[model samples]
Target: TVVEFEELRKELVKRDSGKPVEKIKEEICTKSPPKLIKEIICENKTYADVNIDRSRGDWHVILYLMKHGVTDPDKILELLPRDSKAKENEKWNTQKYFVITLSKAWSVVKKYLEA
Candidate 1:
């Protein structure tokens, strides 16, 4: 019998996390990543997109997000600021900052500060 790999992954997410991956799949389906965010995704579609002459950083941010699956809180936490003081900075409270931070870390997003 040839068992599929995703079957095992799903079984683990269910048993270890007590979170059925149907919830993850449904959440992925239900949410539309916004237009601005889509632009970010499109920019990283290829390696050429990341190393374009126009920008030194294109694929830096979402590389990890795409690698880890965006729905996992653990994945999201991996991108969080390690400095407790920075996380507490009220002036930076916003969704854009979080996205930009992810982008900047990967050297993939160049124009986000202007946004």
Candidate 2:
């Protein structure tokens, strides 16, 4: 549902409300694995970087996608509502990149979704 999907887009808001963008850029760099980090550091650098700061949805996106089994990047890419394509074409890749990246990284670290 685009309802929940759109929710994930804004999920990062108010979650991490203090640090500026550049601060978290350094944070994500040191925190992320080196090789995978390089691939996303291309043209979408700022987009992806800010989105990393926006990765506060440790469950909303991750749990929803995992629970619904929508883990594939392609699935997520197309999942964006095409009806909104008139003004929404810019972020198909941006969201998918950090979507899987953040979820995958956290999913691994989160060995137990339950205690």
Best by TM-score: 2
Candidate 2's displacement at residue 61, Å, is: 17
The TM-score that candidate 2 achieves is 0.28
Count of residue pairs whose backbone atoms collide, per candidate: 7, 0
| Stretches of candidate 2 exceeding 4 Å from the true structure | 25-115
How close to the true structure is residue 24 of candidate 1, measured as C-alpha lDDT?
42
lDDT of 1 by residue, 17-106 (tens): 435444543344345554433333322343233333312222332343333333233343443423322244567554445444443443
lDDT, candidates in the order shown:
0.37, 0.39
Task: TM-score each candidate.
Answer: 0.23, 0.28
**Shift of residue 58 alpha carbon in model 1, Å:** 13
What candidate 1 gets wrong by more than 4 Å, as runs, is 1-62, 78-80, 84-86, 99-115
